């Protein structure tokens, strides 16, 4: 059970024990996705107002 990388300071210490060795979307793309959704919302709201106008 080896112990490696023992660092000691005034507020603590750290070490490592080894028991055995081993065997994106851009700004404009995000803006489009947001405006696409907004567009589908405005379309659905236009169909509503159209429905109510009838």
């Amino acid at each position: 059970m080896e112990v490696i990388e023992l660092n000691k300071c005034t507020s603590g210490q750290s070490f490592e024990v080894i028991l055995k060795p081993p065997s994106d979307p851009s700004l404009e793309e995000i803006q489009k996705k947001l405006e696409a959704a907004e567009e589908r919302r405005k379309y659905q709201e236009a169909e509503l107002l159209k429905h109510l106008a009838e």
Binding site: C9, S14, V17, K20, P22, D24, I30, E38, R40
Partner: protein, 441 residues
């Protein structure tokens, strides 16, 4: 010295951030007014605690934090509470009406109109950093803001801060304290779009925190306050390495290097011990071996699951209080024999150990008892996939009938995003299966 900026999104993120910064101040000797008598460098210094606190010329220590919520009730209690003097108005952002537990409302409808403001306020904090490490993002899975606006913010952060690590503290939904029935939808949706933007996420299942509060703290019906003070203890021991002198997990990058070899599998399991009720006058002080052994009992984990049937890819032990290396080594030797701890063949069978001599701090008047030594184990085990399976199954039950889907399509989201998100989760579950697993007689 490199700075960390904390971002709290939604009611869960904001109220958990409240408990954390309250605890951070108690741990660093910072009073509610922001004064820190121990900081001999007035209005300056690049000490370890300055990773989370900036200093005005008047000696005020201001958290490097921004609170954001699409509805002002929760953030109004920050502006009016004990630590109101801590933050300045620019870092507390509130909207008018919330996302109604609707991912599409938080991400698209409302997020599109507030995202630029949030980034501007973050840039203000970034402009105060000589070497920004990255961000710590707190949020729920199930809320409309915690899920929807978080994933939009994470996308924009990868753009504005390409070479910066992003860590998550995510609240996994539990019916025992759940508000909405659509939280499985919001969890899958936000995990899918956030997956490629988060370097390491610590999931906390409210069901686990709830039972710990009932079993260990003798609280018959825990509230969010009880839950959040316990959560802040775990968060504190996880971030202690960033704001105290030390050599383990001193940089946000180190969390990825030590806990996440496989990028998509970046959800470490957290286990904390001991949690002892303050109503118990005298309680038996647990030893190093006892609390270390407690890190392998399912009842102390932040996500209920059985590590005995997964495989470990990395294991990290974080001690606070009266602990010395030989006590830890002796305890591990005792545990590696009894309990079954199978590491993946392509990873060393070892443990990174960090010790902080300061015992865990407890908020006066809280439910947790002062202990002389505590430990938090971070282990990246495939057993946490059980949490994805559960969640994915609730998603499937509702989506087969398209129940509640119209609320999401009504906010401009396409029905295809559901299946796209679900198939990504199916691939995530298979990634765990590959790394992990090997009638009528």
């Amino acid at each position: 010295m490199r700075e960390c900026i904390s971002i709290h999104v939604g009611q869960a993120g904001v109220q958990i951030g409240n408990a954390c910064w309250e605890l951070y101040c108690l741990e660093h000797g910072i009073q509610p007014d922001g004064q820190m008598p121990s900081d001999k460098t007035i209005g300056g210094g690049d000490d370890s605690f300055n990773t989370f606190f900036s200093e005005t010329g008047a000696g005020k220590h201001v958290p490097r934090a921004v609170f954001v919520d699409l509805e002002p009730t929760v953030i109004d209690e920050v502006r009016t509470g004990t630590y109101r003097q801590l933050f300045h108005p620019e870092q507390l952002i509130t909207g008018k009406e919330d996302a109604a537990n609707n991912y599409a409302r938080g991400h698209y409808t409302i997020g599109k109109e507030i995202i630029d403001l949030v980034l501007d306020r973050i840039r203000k904090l970034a402009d105060q950093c000589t070497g920004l490490q990255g961000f710590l993002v707190f949020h729920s899975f199930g809320g409309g803001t915690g899920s929807g606006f978080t994933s939009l913010l994470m996308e924009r952060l990868s753009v504005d801060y390409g070479k910066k690590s992003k860590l998550e503290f995510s609240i996994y939904p539990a019916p025992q304290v759940s508000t909405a029935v659509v939280e499985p939808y919001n969890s899958i949706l936000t995990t899918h779009t956030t997956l490629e933007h988060s370097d390491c996420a610590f999931m906390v299942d409210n069901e686990a925190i709830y039972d710990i509060c009932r079993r260990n703290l003798d609280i018959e019906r825990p509230t969010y306050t009880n839950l959040n003070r316990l959560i802040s203890q775990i968060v504190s021991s996880i971030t202690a390495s960033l704001r105290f002198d030390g050599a383990l997990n001193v940089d946000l990058t180190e969390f990825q290097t030590n806990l996440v070899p496989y990028p998509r599998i970046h959800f470490p399991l957290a286990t904390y011990a001991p949690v002892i009720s303050a109503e118990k006058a005298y309680h038996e002080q647990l030893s190093v071996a006892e609390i270390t052994n407690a890190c392998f009992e399912p009842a102390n984990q932040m996500v209920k699951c059985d590590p005995r049937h997964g495989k470990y890819m990395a294991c990290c032990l974080l001690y606070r209080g009266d602990v010395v290396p030989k006590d830890v080594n002796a305890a591990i030797a005792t545990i590696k024999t009894k309990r079954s701890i199978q590491f993946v063949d392509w990873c060393p069978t070892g443990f990174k150990v960090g010790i902080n001599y300061q015992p865990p701090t407890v908020v006066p008047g809280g439910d947790l008892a002062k202990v002389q030594r505590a430990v938090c184990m971070l282990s990246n085990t495939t057993a946490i996939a059980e949490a994805w399976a559960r969640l994915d199954h609730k998603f499937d039950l509702m989506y087969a009938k398209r129940a509640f889907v119209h609320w999401y399509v009504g906010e401009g989201m396409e029905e295809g995003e559901f299946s796209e998100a679900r198939e990504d989760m199916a691939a995530l579950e298979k990634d765990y299966e590959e790394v992990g697993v090997d009638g009528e007689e």
